[PDB]
């Protein structure tokens, strides 16, 4: 059931990275977007955000979201999560790091809830193009028409087709830890943490410790506060500094792997044939730019392939050998002459 995914549900931690276009400039958003994969057909997009969707801190859920504000995972009800493109999208399902959504064509993808007192959105420059499966360069999945073996991402989550790495988090920096006691700087740890003390003054440079204080140095701006939180693990993101140790294992299954489904494809209007002596007058009234392919059935193929968008009349020389033409997604047909 839902709770049979503890590996990603329990062990993962929402990490924060450097969104390129966080609102006005590049801030450090908790929803730093990574690995946009718009490689499907019908226009479904898989986005690997830096926030962890679905699971409340308290084991598991789905109506909740876990994002990291500060040193703590301030989880909330997911409520107004946007997934934007040239036009706003409509998300399908969300699972931990990944969120599957269907978008209209565009050149930018932006993600963001709006926690209410603050927005915390993020975008990234990445073109998204949607080629419908078939011979007709349509734009949106139509109500009716024939169906073809398309490829897209399943809405299902309980799959293990592919895996991704997840190791110990790196030494996250946090300046707010370097408080002072009016005589020397005081370090602090919230709970179970083991911070690292480093300062410019000639002193103990290593400073690995629980709650403790500096030896001699006094200038906060002349120190470093690195934080260790190895109790949880994070995704191997390219915007986060590597931990100095071992690549901790644990394969997080990819929630939405591509599958070979069936999409509804458009159906071009039927051509109006008009026979002529050893000549096939073909009246065409395309609705959207559709491929037209024809080939002679004789010894010489004599291929002809050309996209047609504006309604036009084309003619072909149908010899006694015979001729074949495939208009749009219609099944191929054949013809004689006298």
């Amino acid at each position: 059931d839902l709770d049979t995914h503890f590996t990603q549900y329990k062990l993962a931690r929402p990490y924060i990275a450097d969104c390129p276009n966080c609102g006005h400039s590049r801030c450090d958003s908790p929803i730093a977007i990574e690995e946009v994969r718009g490689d499907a057909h019908a226009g479904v997009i898989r986005i690997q955000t830096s926030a962890m969707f679905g699971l409340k801190t308290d084991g598991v859920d789905l109506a909740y979201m876990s994002f990291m504000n500060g040193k703590t995972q301030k989880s909330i009800k997911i409520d107004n999560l946007h997934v934007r493109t040239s036009a706003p999208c409509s998300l399908v399902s969300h699972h931990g790091y990944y969120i599957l959504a269907q978008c209209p064509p565009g050149d930018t993808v932006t993600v963001g809830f709006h926690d209410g007192p603050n927005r915390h959105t993020c975008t990234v420059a990445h073109k998204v193009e949607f080629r419908p499966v078939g011979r007709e360069k349509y734009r949106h999945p139509p109500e009716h028409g024939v169906e073809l073996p398309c490829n897209r991402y399943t809405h299902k989550r309980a799959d293990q087709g592919h895996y991704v790495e997840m190791h110990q988090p790196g030494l996250v920096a946090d300046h707010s830890l370097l408080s002072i006691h009016s005589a020397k700087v005081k370090i602090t740890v919230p709970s179970g943490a083991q911070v690292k003390y480093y300062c410019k003054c000639p002193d103990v440079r290593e400073g690995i410790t629980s709650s403790d204080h500096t030896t001699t140095c006094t200038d906060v701006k002349q120190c470093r506060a690195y934080l260790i939180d190895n109790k949880k693990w994070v995704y191997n993101s390219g915007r986060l500094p590597r931990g100095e140790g071992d690549t901790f294992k644990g394969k997080l299954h990819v929630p939405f792997v591509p599958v070979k489904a069936k999409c509804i494809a458009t159906l071009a209007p039927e051509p109006l044939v008009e026979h002529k002596h050893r000549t096939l007058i073909l009246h065409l009234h395309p609705d959207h730019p559709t491929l037209l392919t024809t080939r002679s059935l004789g010894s010489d193929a004599n291929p002809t392939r050309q996209w047609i968008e504006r309604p036009t009349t084309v003619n072909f020389t149908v010899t006694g050998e015979g001729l074949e033409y495939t208009w749009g997604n219609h099944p191929p047909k054949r013809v004689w002459a006298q």
């Epitope: 110990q168 690995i208 410790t209 629980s210 709650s211 204080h213 190895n230 100095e244 140790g245 071992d246």
Partner: antibody, heavy 125, light 108 residues
Framework: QVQLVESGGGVVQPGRSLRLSCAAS????????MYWVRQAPGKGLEWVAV????????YYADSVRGRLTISRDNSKNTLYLQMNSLRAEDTAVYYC??????????????????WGQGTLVTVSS | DIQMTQSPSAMSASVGDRVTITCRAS??????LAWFQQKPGKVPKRLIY???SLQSGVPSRFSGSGSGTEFTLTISSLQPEDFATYYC?????????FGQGTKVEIKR
Amino acid sequence: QVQLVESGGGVVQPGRSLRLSCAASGFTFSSHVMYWVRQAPGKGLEWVAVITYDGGNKYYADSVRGRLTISRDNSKNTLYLQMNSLRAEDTAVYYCASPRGDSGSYYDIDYFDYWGQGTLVTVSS
Amino acid sequence: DIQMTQSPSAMSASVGDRVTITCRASQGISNYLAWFQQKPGKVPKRLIYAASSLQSGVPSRFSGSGSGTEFTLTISSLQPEDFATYYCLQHNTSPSPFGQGTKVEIKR
């Protein structure tokens, strides 16, 4: 059974160098933190140094910093202490030790459970 | 650096006595501290860790208390095998200094 076996102790002149070794067996040596502790004749214990499972971090008491170098060879299950510029104050039994046999990258809270019998270093002319 | 101060440096006690050894850190070490017994000519043996976790296989007569800067080893009823030198160790930071050791001798 977990064993640690120190070797390379002996008599050395002041200002000379000596290399201690500690062979390990009965546990996954390459996964655990290793420590040197010394005890001068008739004195209390003194913490000398520590090295991580990978050797990537190394720490030293201020009394030995710049003169002693801790190292390891995980392929040989062997810990080393290179001692340079030895002084009469470095005369001690040196003990090889580890925490309980459970692993970590740059973390430990089981300090000093398994130890060797120690090797005597005498620094004298 | 951190320094560990043990009090007393030596004490005389009888079999059956309650022995209390105090260790003070020069800076806070939370509860990342351990206690070690050493008999003459032997290797040290750990008795307590985390300032109160009794080591597996060590007698229930040993007990530990304190947090932050002040810590203790309490032997509830001193046995003939307990006459030894006792060390505290802080393990919160590296370097990890031992205390000077407290020698428990037989009172006569």
